[PDB]
């Protein structure tokens, strides 16, 4: 193998890392193999893949299981104080499986978010374009784009012998000059692996947020009219009819800005002229002359909020220190003091990103009430 000279041979080598990080990788392994296996069992065997989102959710759990296969290799790697005994081939596969799982999982969530926008907002116009053949071709492209993105993890990842400490590690060697490694390999994980897909995921669920709000606020405007019409019928003085007719005019204009609504608002304005002059009987008749169980979930906005923030806060620690790794590689910063805090937090950020990512096929599954039903029958 190659012999290299580490600039900061003590960066990241901490005893609390050699104990806590391998233990965390074991927790991610047990929880990941447990959760993602049940998602495959419920979807592929109890549901037979009948929707587009089921194809994405199945491959989202399959790609996570492939990452967890190499996770014990990194657990004992960190346990032996960053010593790689599995040879050069097994690291080109293990380092690629980490990079392949990042792009694949984030691409699948992007298309799953786009599918949720089309299904909720345009159910009739996007039904014929969202088929099973499109869902499978989308996944094989996601595999290729992820493999094309994890290609440098197979070409340049090598086993290097460190002359400073006689320790055999596997790594990217950020050579000072004449390095065959691309300069901004960490920038690709920033924009293609986080920035661009998150902006598509955030946009998709923001459009769903606005669409459901327009529908829910419209239903609230009709409920305000009918409830106030019942208040007018049970009113006894001019104040009760004036307060209810004022709420109806305001609700009618709210419902209009969502087209004979001006005809209704004009008649409410006529009923207001009667209630203001002390005519209580004449105002009740006007509202009586002019004028059912839709499904609704007022907690869907909390779910949309949780989906977006769970993707952001799980990857934003890993992507920031990945971007900090690019600055050290480009020469913007060469201090070994900041290389230590970057090399220590990087296993921490991996424990946060890939533990939340291996719970995504399970969390997205529990959103489907049919999936939640088969899941609890397996545990019962």
């Amino acid at each position, epitope marked *: 193998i190659k012999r290299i000279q580490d600039d900061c041979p003590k960066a990241g080598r901490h005893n609390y890392i050699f104990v806590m990080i391998p233990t965390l990788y074991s927790i991610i392994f047990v929880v990941g193999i447990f959760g993602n296996s049940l998602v495959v069992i419920v*979807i592929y065997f109890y*549901m037979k893949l009948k929707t587009v989102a089921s194809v994405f959710l199945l491959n989202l759990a399959l790609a996570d299981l492939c990452f967890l296969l190499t996770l014990p290799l990194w657990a004992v790697y960190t346990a032996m104080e960053y010593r790689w005994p599995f040879g050069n081939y097994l690291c080109k596969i293990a380092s690629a499986s980490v990079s392949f799982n990042l792009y694949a999982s984030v691409f699948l969530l992007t298309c799953l978010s786009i599918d949720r926008y089309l299904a909720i907002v345009h159910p009739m116009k996007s039904r014929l374009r969202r088929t099973m053949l499109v869902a499978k071709v989308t996944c094989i492209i996601i595999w290729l784009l992820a493999g094309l993105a994890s290609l440098p993890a197979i070409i340049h990842r090598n086993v290097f012998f460190i002359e400073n400490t006689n320790i055999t590690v596997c790594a990217f060697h950020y050579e000072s000059q004449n390095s065959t490694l691309p300069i901004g390999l960490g920038l690709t994980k920033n924009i293609l692996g986080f920035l661009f897909p998150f902006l598509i995921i955030l946009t998709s669920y923001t459009l769903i947020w606005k669409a459901l709000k327009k529908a829910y606020d419209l239903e609230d405007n009709w409920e305000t009219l009918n409830d106030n019409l019942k208040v007018i019928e049970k009113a006894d003085n001019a104040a009760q009819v004036k307060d209810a007719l004022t709420k109806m005019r305001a609700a009618a204009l709210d419902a209009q800005k969502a087209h004979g609504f001006d005809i209704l608002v004009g008649q409410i304005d006529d009923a207001l002229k009667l209630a203001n002059e002390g005519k209580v009987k004449e105002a009740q008749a006007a509202a009586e002359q002019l004028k*059912k169980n839709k*499904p609704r979930n007022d907690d869907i906005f909390k779910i949309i909020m949780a989906i977006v923030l769970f993707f952001f806060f799980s990857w934003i620690p890993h992507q920031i220190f990945t971007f900090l790794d690019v600055l050290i590689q480009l020469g913007i910063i060469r201090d070994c003091r900041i290389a230590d805090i970057v090399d220590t937090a990087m296993p921490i950020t991996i424990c946060i990103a890939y533990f939340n990512n291996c719970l995504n096929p399970l969390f997205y599954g529990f959103l489907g009430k049919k999936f939640k039903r088969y899941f609890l029958q397996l545990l019962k």
Partner: nanobody
Amino acid sequence: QVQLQESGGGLVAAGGSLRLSCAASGNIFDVDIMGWYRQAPGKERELVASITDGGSTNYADSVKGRFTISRDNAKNTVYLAMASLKPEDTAVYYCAAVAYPDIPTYFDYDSDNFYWGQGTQVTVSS
């Protein structure tokens, strides 16, 4: 399940009229959006018309001005009043409907909250 029964198909001469019906049965709650699809022989399926619970309709360019889709939210039935039928309209017309469960999460890995019908044949001869 949300079943869809369609009726009204038949062989009519060119330029005639027809009225397709499709009532939704087996739904505890109201259907959200319903519409009609047709599949010509040898050609892919297309969306003819759709109408929401509010009354907004979206017609295809090949049937705009001729077909008039309507519905009755009380009975959860959609009506496709076809007029000036052309031999190009000879296809199997399918009924579609979107129905969400109680407290909907808008995630369905079983049917995508989308339900179809059996299909009624509509033939227009010269």
